[PDB]
Design a binder for this molecule. Structure first.
Ligand SMILES: *C/C=C(\C)CC/C=C(\C)CCC=C(C)C
Ligand SMILES: [Zn+2]
Lengths: 323, 407, 5
């Protein structure tokens, strides 16, 4: 009906069809703190909302009023709750409500209430058919929208819509290989489908990641993913990894490559590798290069790593005090 | 020496910390480059102007901004009409950090206002007449504790608060944010924070909560909002802090957590980003850097012998430089980054992060690093609650006198 | 702006 931005929008206190209701002003107390000087429109809609809420009026007019209260402040969770009460009591068409929430989310995509409301609608309707495409549209405007990715994981998991997600992930990684949200989604899909234990899958993944690293040596996400998928089984469990990383040292170095080498040495030392000492020194040398030259912002972390590796892997580490 | 630059961000070598896009341009790198260029301008400003840099925390300006905001706000805050207890908390905490006393006229009015926000069934809402929600409940309790008077403490209806927490608890260990609301790690933290402070933790209230939080830690090392989601500073802080309160930090792989948070500090800007490959933002000076004191306390409890006895595991100096040089609004208030407008949320978290960066404390060991003028030093903040350590102790002690509801 | 609730 009458949009909040309509040139001919009229305050509720000037609407004949609302003459029977006494608006309920906000109870801020005798001497308010953090008192917001609301605009006329805001205070008017909310004084009427307080009235309908207070008398629990489950009417069509109350329903339309919540649309205005939401447009004035979409973060008002109390209004959203009352709106859901009205949707049920008045038996409102939920697909019409879906059309409404998709418009609101398009407008205010980084809001908690709007995404939760959409979830409730999907649950009520037991229909996820518009989800992936809707979300894809939001992700097309902000490829890192946290609420969008979170809702997407929920839909996919609850309705088992795994079939095309990896293809979607590949598409977004093409658009921006630096999108950490997509790398997280990639891990999400694989973990809940094939898993990473399947050797053919794990290899495909590491191959892909090393390939992305070669193309963009300084993209921290690829590095984190590579480490993320191998760290659990143990970095030392993969002897060829080290050799291969060292092969990128010249034409593809970065503090990320150096940091990874330390991660490999650290695990090797943790699993009694050969040449305990030769490895430890290579590690402390890299830690120093990082703390003092290649990654000084993390000097405190690197000095700590160097100090930990020293503390438990030096030839003196297992040697009693008396010796 | 004389040619030596004491400010880390202005050193000649610092230019080496600029982004290397490998000639592969993507939205991420383009956006990152824009921020770095803007930040570089701030850094080089003293040099182009031929002035010696002086890092001054504009206290008087920040005080005026807060002092007024605690009383009245413009319609710019309509979007926060359901977060009034947060406005109370953010402001009172910023004032507390700045060591500005809270007049008893003010204290009593805040108490009365928060009472109006308290629900008949427990918890606090975003404003009078609004349904209770865990976020404004966390903020309200923190604000009342910052005040710390008998009157303030007495506002909290502990029995109904406990009932409220139970009504939100889920079978999987998580909590809803409010009735009919969403679930994410914020709820676990908000619940543990208020329940621990008020001494209402029953034996089963947090049953399975630590496990649920542990499921949020992902392949990155950090913690996401819910299991499966990308590692995020705000949620990571909520997860770790909640686990520290529950005394279950060990459920996490603290090693990967530590490596992840430390990697979130930006090499060029000096401040922290919320997620890998995203932009720097002053509020993360708290959510991210605040994890270091938590990790230090946890690792130390495990007898970690390599832990420093004078510094947190982050570049304290660079964080302070970022905040002081890039996050202050000239008119008062702090912000996200240059080009963004001030707000009380960023004012609260930039200052909180600054305090964390200035003060190292681990038992008897104490070491401060105050960049710029010595007047820049703020009051310390508790890394779990983000209110003065003294307020935490005072509040807990007071509530330990009462018995846990029901007994 | 950053929204936390
Ligand atoms: C731009 C900064 C944002 C969106 C902040 C993200 C932080 C959180 C989410 C953490 C919220 C914590 C509580 C509500 C206790
Ligand atoms: Zn922010």
């Amino acid at each position: 009906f009458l949009s909040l931005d309509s040139p001919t929008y009229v305050l509720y206190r000037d609407r004949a069809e609302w003459a029977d209701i006494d608006p309920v002003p906000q109870n801020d107390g005798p001497s308010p703190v953090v008192q917001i000087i609301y605009s006329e429109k805001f205070r008017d809609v909310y004084d009427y909302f307080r009235a309908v809420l207070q008398r629990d009026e489950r009417s069509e007019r109350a329903f339309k009023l919540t649309r205005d209260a939401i447009e004035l402040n979409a973060a008002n969770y109390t209004v959203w709750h009352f709106r859901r009460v009205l949707l049920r009591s008045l038996q409102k068409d939920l697909q019409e409500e879906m059309n409404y929430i998709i418009a609101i989310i398009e407008e205010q995509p980084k809001n908690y209430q709007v995404w939760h409301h959409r979830r409730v609608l999907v649950e009520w309707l037991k229909d996820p058919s518009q989800e992936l495409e809707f979300i894809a549209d939001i992700l097309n405007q902000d490829a890192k929208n946290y609420h969008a990715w979170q809702h997407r994981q929920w839909v996919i998991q609850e309705f088992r819509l795994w079939d095309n997600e990896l293809q979607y992930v590949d598409q977004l990684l093409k658009e921006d290989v630096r999108n950490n949200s997509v790398w997280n989604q990639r891990h999400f899909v694989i973990s809940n489908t094939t898993g990473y234990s399947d050797r053919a899958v794990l290899e495909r993944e590491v191959q892909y990641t090393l390939e992305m690293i070669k193309l963009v040596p300084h993209n921290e996400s690829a590095w984190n993913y590579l480490k993320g998928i191998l760290q659990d089984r143990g970095l030392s469990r993969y002897p060829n990894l080290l050799n291969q990383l060292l092969d990128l040292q010249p034409s593809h170095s970065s503090p990320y490559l150096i940091a990874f080498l330390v991660d490999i040495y650290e695990d090797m030392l943790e699993n009694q590798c050969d040449n305990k000492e030769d490895i430890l020194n290579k590690a402390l040398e890299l830690c120093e290069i990082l703390a003092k030259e290649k990654d000084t912002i993390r000097k405190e972390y690197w000095r700590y790593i160097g100090r930990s590796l020293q503390s438990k892997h030096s030839r003196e580490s297992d040697i009693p005090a008396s010796v | 020496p004389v040619w030596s630059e004491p400010l880390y961000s202005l050193r000649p070598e610092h230019a080496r910390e600029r982004l290397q896009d490998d000639s592969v341009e993507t939205v991420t790198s383009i956006e990152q480059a824009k921020v770095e260029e803007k930040i570089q301008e701030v850094f080089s400003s003293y040099k182009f102007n031929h002035l010696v840099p002086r890092l001054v925390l504009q206290r008087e300006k920040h005080f005026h901004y807060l002092k007024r905001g605690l009383r009245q706000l413009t319609d710019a805050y309509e979007c926060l009409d359901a977060s009034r207890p947060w406005l109370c908390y953010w402001i009172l905490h910023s004032l507390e950090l700045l060591d500005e006393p809270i007049p008893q006229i003010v204290a009593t009015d805040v108490c009365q206002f928060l009472e109006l926000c308290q629900s008949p069934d427990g918890g606090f809402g975003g404003g009078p007449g609004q349904y209770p929600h865990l976020a404004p409940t966390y903020a309200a309790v923190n604000a009342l504790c910052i005040i710390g008077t008998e009157e303030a403490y007495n506002v909290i209806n502990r029995e109904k608060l406990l009932q409220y927490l139970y009504s939100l608890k889920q079978p999987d260990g998580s909590f809803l944010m409010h009735v009919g609301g969403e679930v994410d790690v914020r709820s676990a933290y908000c619940a543990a924070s208020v329940a621990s402070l008020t001494n209402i933790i029953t034996p089963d209230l947090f049953e399975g909560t630590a496990e649920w939080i542990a499921r949020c830690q992902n392949w990155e090392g950090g913690i996401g909002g819910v299991p499966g989601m990308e590692a995020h500073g705000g949620y990571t802080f909520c997860g770790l802090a909640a686990l520290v309160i529950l005394k279950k930090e060990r459920s996490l792989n603290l090693k990967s957590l530590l490596q992840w948070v430390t990697s979130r500090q930006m090499r060029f800007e000096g401040g922290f980003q919320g997620r890998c490959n995203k932009l720097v933002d002053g509020c993360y000076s708290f959510w991210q850097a605040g994890l270091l004191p938590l990790l230090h306390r946890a690792l130390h409890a495990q007898g970690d012998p390599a832990l420093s006895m004078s510094h947190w595991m982050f570049h304290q100096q660079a964080l302070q430089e970022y905040i002081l040089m890039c996050c202050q609004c000239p008119a008062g208030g702090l912000l996200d980054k240059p080009g963004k407008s001030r707000d009380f949320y960023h004012t609260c978290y930039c200052l909180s992060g600054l305090s964390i960066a200035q003060h190292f404390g681990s038992g008897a060991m104490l070491h401060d690093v105050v960049m710029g003028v010595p007047e820049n030093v703020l009051q310390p903040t508790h890394p779990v609650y983000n209110i003065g350590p003294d307020k935490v102790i005072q509040a807990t002690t007071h509530f330990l006198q009462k018995p846990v509801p029901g007994f | 702006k950053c929204v936390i609730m």
